[PDB]
Amino acid sequence: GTLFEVVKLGKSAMQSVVDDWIESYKQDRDIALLDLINFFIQCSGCRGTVRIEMFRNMQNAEIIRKMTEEFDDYPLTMPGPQWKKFRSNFCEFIGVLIRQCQYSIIYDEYMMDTVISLLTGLSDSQVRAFRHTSTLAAMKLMTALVNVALNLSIHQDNTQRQYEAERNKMIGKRANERLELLLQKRKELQENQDEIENMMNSIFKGIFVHRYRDAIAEIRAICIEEIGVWMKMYSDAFLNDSYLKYVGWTLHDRQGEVRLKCLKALQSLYTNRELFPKLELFTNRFKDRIVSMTLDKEYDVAVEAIRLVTLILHG
Ligand SMILES: Oc1ccc(CN2CCc3ccccc3C2)cc1
């Protein structure tokens, strides 16, 4: 509306285009997801675009096979001022998209299934551009879902404290309407969390477990950096010896870039004197590798290995 109104209300270009996308999704899921599919294609620097007939009739396999041929150096590698902010923008887009869809659309069983299947399929592509773009997207997607799970948790606690106060207040008395709504609230929220845990599994088992050992070092780095993020954000779910084995296995990586990320991830965990108990078995299992990297060969890896070891020491 007015200039005062538009300024006080600092919706970015990205927040605006996600509000519009949601409005379009509510008119026609199909055209909205086609646009979202084309976005991920254009983001890879692919010069083709999916039409509504392909979307409705073709499997992701066929779509990706047909877009594989329409390939001429992709946005995420470009140097130049006009692509400086692209990576940062791409990542922000995905958090804004999902933050905004987090209360309804995400739980419709069509939007997230479409995106994740497309990302999974692109992550199995021979084309570097496709693997790099889809994995980075899926890794930020996962983090966006973890933030949703954290928001659900808060509500799940307030629903549980309210359900208690009302269950106590009754006792001997017939279960009234307030108690039935809260007992129905509490099921819905836990059913929401199951669905989040589900999308996180599809992304983890479909993309992460394959991409973290990718041929391309930047893709390996992207995976390691992000599992470190899930392990700090949501400790009860991701900070365990099955997920940690991925980080430890990758300490042995051939590239500084990737060894560096493994150490930055473990640094963020070991600083918190609280999940320090949950790293005991991990510390016994990989103390030898960690301690060896203090003299790594790449200066900056050594500096980080040394910083990690002093963290472990002080705990
Ligand atoms: O994001 C989360 C991931 C896992 C859990 C739940 N735990 C226990 C349930 C379960 C069942 C079978 C195998 C593994 C698991 C995982 C909670 C949150």
UniProtKB/Swiss-Prot annotation:
Residues 208-293 form the SCD domain. It comes from the Eukaryota. It is found in: Nucleus; Chromosome; Chromosome, Centromere. Phosphorylated by PLK1. The large dissociation of cohesin from chromosome arms during prophase is partly due to its phosphorylation. Component of cohesin complex, a complex required for the cohesion of sister chromatids after DNA replication. The cohesin complex apparently forms a large proteinaceous ring within which sister chromatids can be trapped. At anaphase, the complex is cleaved and dissociates from chromatin, allowing sister chromatids to segregate. The cohesin complex may also play a role in spindle pole assembly during mitosis. Cohesin complexes are composed of a heterodimer between a SMC1 protein (SMC1A or SMC1B) and SMC3, which are attached via their hinge domain, and RAD21 which link them at their heads, and one STAG protein (STAG1, STAG2 or STAG3). In cohesin complexes, STAG1 is mutually exclusive with STAG2 and STAG3. Interacts directly with RAD21 in cohesin complex. The cohesin complex interacts with the cohesin loading complex subunits NIPBL/Scc2 (via HEAT repeats) and MAU2/Scc4. NIPBL directly contacts all members of the complex, RAD21, SMC1A/B, SMC3 and STAG1. Belongs to the SCC3 family. It is linked to Intellectual developmental disorder, autosomal dominant 47: A disorder characterized by significantly below average general intellectual functioning associated with impairments in adaptive behavior and manifested during the developmental period. MRD47 patients manifest developmental delay and mild to moderate intellectual disability, usually with delayed speech. This is Cohesin subunit SA-1. It comes from Homo sapiens (Human). The lineage of its organism: Eukaryota, Metazoa, Chordata, Craniata, Vertebrata. The gene is STAG1. The chain holds residues 86 to 403 of 1258 of the full protein.
